[PDB]
Write a protein that binds this ligand. Structure first.
Ligand SMILES: Nc1ncnc2c1ncn2[C@@H]1O[C@H](COP(=O)(O)OP(=O)(O)NP(=O)(O)O)[C@@H](O)[C@H]1O
Length: 161
């Protein structure tokens, strides 16, 4: 009990630093490398917090060679990416990785009734930024999540001549 306003203005380096101190308790070889300055995106520190955790849970339990949590940003668009060692995505699964949008006139559902815990997807989906997956030779997988910032005022230096 105590108010509950979600999706608001939050720093991406501030939310990741919270999940870092939480996921860094015993061998969670998490290499932190956030934008050394100050990010700023209106997001939900909750959903995002869970989005970074469930991401390392796959490299910590099965994986155990190296985990990496980094965050960057740009003018009118900040984002954060992760990296972990392991086998990487499969050759066939790369095509069926919880991809949204379908194309067909029939689904042919045989079974699979229960709950729908698609965490992570609704996260970047509730922000409206981006979500992509990459892998270097199925050896160095890295996640690319984006979070667009609300209108701002950043021009930079520009001489007239
Ligand atoms: N670090 C990763 N991040 C995102 N996708 C990954 C990663 N490593 C592998 N993948 C691919 O996505 C799947 C792993 O994460 P995820 O998509 O959550 O699993 P899932 O098979 O869809 N559900 P489950 O594995 O039962 O928890 C694998 O089947 C790979 O094809």
């Amino acid at each position: 009990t105590g108010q509950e306003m979600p999706m608001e203005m939050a720093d991406l380096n501030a939310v990741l630093g919270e999940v870092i101190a939480a996921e860094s308790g015993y061998e969670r070889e998490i290499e932190t490398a956030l934008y050394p300055g100050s990010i700023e995106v209106k997001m939900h520190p909750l959903s995002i917090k869970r989005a970074v955790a469930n991401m390392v849970v796959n490299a910590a339990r099965y994986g155990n060679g190296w985990i990496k949590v980094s965050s960057g940003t740009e003018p009118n668009r900040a984002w954060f990416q992760v990296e972990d060692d392991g086998p990487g995505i499969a050759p066939e699964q790369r095509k069926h990785l919880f991809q949204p949008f379908v194309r067909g006139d029939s689904a042919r559902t045989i079974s699979g009734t229960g709950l729908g815990l698609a965490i992570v997807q609704r996260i970047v989906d509730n922000h409206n930024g981006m979500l992509e997956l990459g892998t270097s030779e199925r050896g160095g997988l890295s996640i690319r999540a984006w979070l667009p910032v609300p209108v701002t005022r950043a021009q930079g230096t520009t001489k007239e001549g």
